[PDB]
Amino acid sequence: GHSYEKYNNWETIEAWTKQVTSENPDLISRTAIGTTFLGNNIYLLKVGKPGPNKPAIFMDCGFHAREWISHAFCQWFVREAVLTYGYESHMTEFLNKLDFYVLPVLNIDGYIYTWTKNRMWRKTRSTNAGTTCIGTDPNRNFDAGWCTTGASTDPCDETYCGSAAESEKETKALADFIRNNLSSIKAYLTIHSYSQMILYPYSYDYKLPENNAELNNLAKAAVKELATLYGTKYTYGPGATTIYPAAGGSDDWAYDQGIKYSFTFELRDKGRYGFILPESQIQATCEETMLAIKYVTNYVLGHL
Numbered sequence: 001g002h003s004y005e006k007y008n009n010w011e012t013i014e015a016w017t018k019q020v021t022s023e024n025p026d027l028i029s030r031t032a033i034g035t036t037f038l039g040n041n042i043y044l045l046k047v048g049k050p051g052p053n054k055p056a057i058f059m060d061c062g063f064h065a066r067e068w069i070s071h072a073f074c075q076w077f078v079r080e081a082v083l084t085y086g087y088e089s090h091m092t093e094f095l096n097k098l099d100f101y102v103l104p105v106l107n108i109d110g111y112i113y114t115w116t117k118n119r120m121w122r123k124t125r126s127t128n129a130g131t132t133c134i135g136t137d138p139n140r141n142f143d144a145g146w147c148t149t150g151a152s153t154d155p156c157d158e159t160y161c162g163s164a165a166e167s168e169k170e171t172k173a174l175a176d177f178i179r180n181n182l183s184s185i186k187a188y189l190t191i192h193s194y195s196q197m198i199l200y201p202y203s204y205d206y207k208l209p210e211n212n213a214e215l216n217n218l219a220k221a222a223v224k225e226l227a228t229l230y231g232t233k234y235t236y237g238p239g240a241t242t243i244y245p246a247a248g249g250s251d252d253w254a255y256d257q258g259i260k261y262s263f264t265f266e267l268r269d270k271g272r273y274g275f276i277l278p279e280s281q282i283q284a285t286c287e288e289t290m291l292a293i294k295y296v297t298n299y300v301l302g303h304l
């Protein structure tokens with residue numbers, strides 16, 4: 001069975017996408033935006049009160065297979081949305097005015113592998129020509145200074161950038177969807193772990209985004225909001241100087257598509273458990289993260 005305070009395998013998450021949609025058709029529509037290398041369905045949930053020409057925020061989880069708290073958060077977010085709509089004034093206004101595109105698990109093949117074989121797998125599970133080595137790092141596979149820094153050209157490496165940008169079916173699927181909906185998507189939020197940070201562009205270069213002052217102020221307020229709940233401390237800043245230079249990430253790519261609010265979230269913790277965050281921290285992690293996401297949403301909406 002599904003549980004929001006446990007990590008769920010893909011079969012269970014998939015069944016959940018169907019069930020939560022069936023139980024809330026007036027707040028959720030489910031589509032598939034492509035298949036993975038191994039033929040799993042890349043679901044996208046459109047969360048919001050349906051209506052014509054609504055702006056949107058796009059959020060994905062599960063880019064990286066071992067970052068299980070990421071997958072957990074997207075599911076947590078969807079429940080909060082459907083349970084509090086109509087009762088909590090902010091979420092009610094959010095869903096009335098915009099849609100959240102929630103992509104609960106991007107790298108499904110890798111996620112399944114962390115359940116079946118290797119908990120610490122990171123990459124996709126696609127084959128590579130001329131080698132037995134498996135997989136591409138999806139967050140090195142976007143057209144953002146592709147493969148120029150912080151990435152490997154070797155398929156046996158954890159940060160393999162791929163044979164070319166969008167060489168992976170999953171990243172191509174995400175990029176295609178975002179490109180087809182640029183008129184509506186106002187923010188891009190991509191959920192990772194761990195490090196307790198909010199990053200904004202750029203990571204592929206030390207250059208700063210034109211609105212970097214605004215992004216810094218926004219990230220600063222979001223981390224302040226997050227801390228109000230349990231005291232959890234986040235830092236923030238441009239990716240390149242705040243964590244490390246790295247090319248081909250989706251946050252940088254989305255920003256260069258014209259999406260002015262683009263953030264990579266790194267959830268708990270700071271390394272004590274690392275990727276293996278206990279299920280006993282799922283609820284607190286998700287609840288505080290919700291405050292940061294809602295703050296950003298409220299800001300983006302108020303500035304349309």
Ligand SMILES: CC(C)[C@H](NC(=O)CCc1ccccc1)P(=O)(O)O[C@H](C(=O)O)c1cccc(NC(=N)N)c1
Nearest residue numbers: 139158192193194195199203239243246249250252264
């Ligand atoms: C613990 C966090 C920081 C994760 N990092 C890792 O697992 C380390 C990856 C690695 C493995 C082997 C050699 C070098 C680097 P991440 O979630 O994978 O970090 C993201 C990434 O490297 O794709 C990340 C963090 C912050 C900003 C970005 N954005 C970006 N465009 N690079 C991306």
Ligand SMILES: [Zn+2]
Nearest residue numbers: 064067192193
């Ligand atoms: Zn990650």
